Design a binder for this molecule. Structure first.
Ligand SMILES: CCOc1ccc(C(C)=O)cc1-c1cccc(-c2nn[nH]n2)c1
Ligand SMILES: CCOc1ccc(C(C)=O)cc1-c1cccc(-c2nn[nH]n2)c1
Length: 118
């Protein structure tokens, strides 16, 4: 049979937190992603029009710590949401877009063997 595995939040934290840590350890590349974008402080008033579902590393980390992910796919979705938001909002020539691309390469490398082990 093809059984759907049940995951406990503390098990997801142990398995998935290292993949998030790998993003945070990229410096300077993770710096734009460590806290929610504040459009007022960054002077980008159109941000929340373009980005309907903001996401950032601090939110993902707190969701892992506090057990808000029932399934690993939800964590993976939040990470790709964060990256796709940044590629959407920022220009291809921009520092943040290029940092995003680096983080996404790191994430793809880290998430695949972890998800295979899960
Ligand atoms: C909430 C802010 O989190 C961070 C901030 C900065 C940095 C840096 C400087 O690298 C790392 C984290 C972070 C994140 C998740 C896991 C871990 C971690 N878990 N076990 N070892 N490291 C470390
Ligand atoms: C100067 C333009 O900032 C941004 C533009 C877009 C976005 C996003 C994620 O779409 C993020 C930031 C941002 C936010 C906080 C810190 C930093 C930062 N701190 N050190 N280096 N970069 C960069």
């Amino acid at each position: 049979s093809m059984r759907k595995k049940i995951f406990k939040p503390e098990e997801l934290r142990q398995a998935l937190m290292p993949t998030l840590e790998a993003l945070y350890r990229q410096d300077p590349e993770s710096l734009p992603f460590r806290q929610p974008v504040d459009p007022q402080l960054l002077g980008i008033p159109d941000y929340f029009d373009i980005v309907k579902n903001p996401m950032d590393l601090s939110t993902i980390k707190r969701k892992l710590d506090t057990g808000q992910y029932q399934e690993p796919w939800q964590y993976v979705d939040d990470v790709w949401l964060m990256f796709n938001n940044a590629w959407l909002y920022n220009r291809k020539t921009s520092r943040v877009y290029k940092f995003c691309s680096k983080l996404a390469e790191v994430f793809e490398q880290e998430i695949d063997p972890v998800m295979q082990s899960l």
